[PDB]
Amino acid sequence: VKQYYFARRGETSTHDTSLPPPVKVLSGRSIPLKEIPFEATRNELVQIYLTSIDKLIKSNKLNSIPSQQIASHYLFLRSLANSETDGIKKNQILSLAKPLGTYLASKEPHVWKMINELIEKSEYPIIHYLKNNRAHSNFMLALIHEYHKEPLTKNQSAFVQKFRDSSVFLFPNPIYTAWLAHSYDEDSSFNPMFRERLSTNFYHSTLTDNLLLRTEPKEVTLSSEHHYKKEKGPIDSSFRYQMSSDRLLRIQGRTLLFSTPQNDVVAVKVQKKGEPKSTLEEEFEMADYLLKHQRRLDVHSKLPQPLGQYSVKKSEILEISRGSLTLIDDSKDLEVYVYKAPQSYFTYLHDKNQDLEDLTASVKTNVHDLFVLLREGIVFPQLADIFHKGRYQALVQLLNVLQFQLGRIDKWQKAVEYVNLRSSGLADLGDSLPITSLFTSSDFTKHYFSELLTGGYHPTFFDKSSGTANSLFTGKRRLFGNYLYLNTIAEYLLVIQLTLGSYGDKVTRDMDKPKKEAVWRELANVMFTSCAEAIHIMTGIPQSRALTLLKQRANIEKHFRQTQFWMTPDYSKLDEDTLQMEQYSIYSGEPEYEFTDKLVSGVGLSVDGVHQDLGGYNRESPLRELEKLLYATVTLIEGTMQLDKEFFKQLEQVEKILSGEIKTDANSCFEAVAQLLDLARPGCHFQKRLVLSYYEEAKLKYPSAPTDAYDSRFQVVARTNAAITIQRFWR
Amino acid sequence: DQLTEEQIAEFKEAFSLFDKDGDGTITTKELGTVMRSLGQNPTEAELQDMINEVDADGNGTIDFPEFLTMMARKMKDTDSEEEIREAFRVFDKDGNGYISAAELRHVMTNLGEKLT
Ligand SMILES: Nc1ncnc2c1ncn2[C@@H]1O[C@H](COP(=O)(O)O)[C@@H](O)[C@H]1O
C-alpha cells in the first residue's frame, strides 16, 4: 500500500517575522542590533585577496612563499575562475594566476607536476588539495595581511575574526559546499583540529555555521490531512475500563498498570497537578493518527491502542491503589487517558535487563521512528529532562554568541531516568509539536532560544561611533529555523547517547575489565550506527557509506574510551597524578579535560554530591568526541542537501546548454558539464553516471571541439560504471 | 526478494535525491531523469501502474524490476569490456583483476577463463 509523507518541504524568503525587536537594553541605554551580511562581506575579502595577488606579483617576492602555499594561491584562483560565469571577469582572475604558473613551472617544477594532476581531476582542484592539514593554513588571509597594507573595514574584521581558522570559509558557495561534503571521503585526512602554539583548536562547529549562513530559509508545508491541520472529531470514549485492584500490576509514576488475560497491559494515565485535559486529548489523538498511518509511514514501534479519555472521581483512583506507590491532582475529578500497550512499552530503553541483541534493535526502532516522524512534521522536544531558560542546547555554539564549547549535563542519568524511548518504541506521544513551531516565533522558540531570535550583544560588537552592535550572529534571524532544525537532530541523538550511557553504567557496575570494555565498545558502535541511520532517512545516503563518512570525522575508539571513563564512577578512586595519567588514553592528542571541582568519592564529578554530573560546574562536557559526532552528523545532513541543491542548479544549466535554450561555445559547454561532476555526492555513482550521459550528449552537440581536459575525468566514470556492470552482474 | 540489496539502495538514494520536495512521491517529469541516471533512456514510460497520478518508492521498486527484467543483460556485459579492450577482441590480461579491485567489490574473484 502507499508510503509517503504529509509534509512537502521548500524554501521561503525570511524567518524574521513576528520576531522580538533586535535590541539589547544595557543600563537604561538601548542598543540596536545590526546584521553583518555574510556573502557581501565574503566577496569583499576575496576582492581584497585578488587585488593583493597583483601586489604580490608586482613585488617580485614570490620566493618568500613556500611552494605549498603558492600551490594554494594557484589552485584556488584556477578553481575560483571556473566557478565564474562571464568570460571577461573569468580571465581577469586567470591573468592573475598565470605568473604563479610561469613561476611554478620554472622554479618549482615538481610542485607544478603534482597540482597538474589535480587540475585534470576537478574544476575545483582546491577542494581536493585542501583535504588535509593544508586546509588549516589560511593562505588567503596571510596574503591579505602581507600585501594589503591598509586596515580592513569593521565588517571585514568581524568576518575574519570569526572565520580565521581556514581559507575555505572565503570560498564562494559551490566550492565550500563541495569541499565540505568531500572532506568526509575515503581519501580525506581533514579533521577540524589544528594545534597552535601548544594550544589545540577545534572548529567543527564553525564548519556548520559557515554552511548555514549561505543557505536559504527552509519552510515546511504540512498537508491538509496532517495531524495538525485535519479537523478532528471528539474522542469517542464509549467504553470505560473497570479498574480492578487484583489486576493492578504496578504504578509507574502516575500511570496504573493493569494486567490482562491477553498478557498485555491496560494503562491508565491520570491528570497531573497542573496538566489540563488537552494534554491527555493530545496523546490520544496522536496514537490514533500513528496507528492509522503506521503502514503508510513504516513506523517500527509497537504503538499503543488508545481506549478512552474521560473524567474519574479522585476517590476511586486513590482507593484503587494501596501498593508501594503524590503526583496526581488535588481532590475532585482527575481527567484520565487509558490505553493498551505491550509490556515492552514500559521497560525503558536503558534497562540493564536488556541483552545487547534486544537493546540494539530497540534502539534502532526508536531512532527510526524519531526521524521518520520528523520528516512527517512531528517533533518530540520533551524526550528527556536535560538541563545545564535552563534547558540543554545540543548545538550550543551555533545558537549563542559566546558559547565557546559544549555544556555540562547535570544528571545525565536522572535526565533519562524516565525517558520516552521504550523497548517497544516511542512512548508519551502527547508531548508532540508541529515542525512549523521550529521555523516560527512560537512560544517555544522565543522562550528557549531568545538570543538566536533577538540578535546577540557583546562589547566587541559595539560601534562607539554608530551606537549600534554589529555582528554576523544577527544575520541568523533570517535563517534561525534551519538552526533549530539541526539542533533537533542532535537533540534526538544526544538522548540516545545518555540512554546508552545509563545502560552501560548499570550493567558494568559490579563486573572482568576486558568483558566490561566489550559492552562499552558495542555501545559506541550503536551510537555511530544510530547517527548514520539518521543520515540515511534524511538524505537517502546508504547507511553503510554515511557510516564511513562519519568515521572520517569521529573516532569510535576515543568515543568508546571517553564514555566508559566519564559515565562510570571508577575514576573517582584515582589520585590527581594518576587521573591525568589515564586521561591521556581517552584523548591521546587532545588536551586533557581540565577541571577544578572536588571529586565526590563513589560518584565522581557531582554538584549535589549524590548524582554524577557530566563536566565541571561552569565547564564543558568531557565527552568531546560526542560533540564532534553530533556536529559531523548534522553537517553531513545539511551539507548533503546543499550539495544536491548546488548540483541541481547546475544540472539546469547543462540542460539549457544542450537543449539550445542558452547559446554558448563548446569549451564553455563542457565546462558546465565537468563542473556538474564536482557537485555529485561522494560515493554516489548514479550521479556520476548521469553527468556522464550529459557529457556524451555534449560531444554530439559540439563534435568539432577538442576534449583534452575533460577526457580522463569522464573516462574513470566510464571505467567505474563499466566495472560495476560486471560486478553488479556477477549474480 | 527478486531484487538484490546492492541496487535497492541505489534506487533508494536516486529516488530520495530527485524527490526534491521530500514528500516521498515523485513526478513523471523528474522520473525520466532518475532512470537516465539509473541507466535507462526509455521511449515513453507514461504507461505505469500507480494509485492516481504519482508514485512513491513502493511504486518505484516494483515498477523498476518490471523494466529491469527486460534488459538484454548479455548486450551490456559485452559493452563493459569494450570500455577496456584496447584494440579489440582482447578484454584484459591483468586489468580484469585490477579493474575489479576497487569499483564496487573484490573478494577472491574466481580466476576461471585463465590462460588455458
Ligand atoms: N507533560 C507530559 N505529558 C505527558 N507525558 C509526559 C509529560 N512529561 C513526560 N511524559 C512522559 O510520559 C510517560 C508517562 O509518564 P507521565 O510523565 O506521567 O505522562 C513517561 O515516559 C514520561 O517521561
Ligand SMILES: [Ca+2]
Ligand atoms: Ca514529490
Ligand SMILES: [Cl-]
Ligand atoms: Cl604570505
Ligand SMILES: [Cl-]
Ligand atoms: Cl556569528
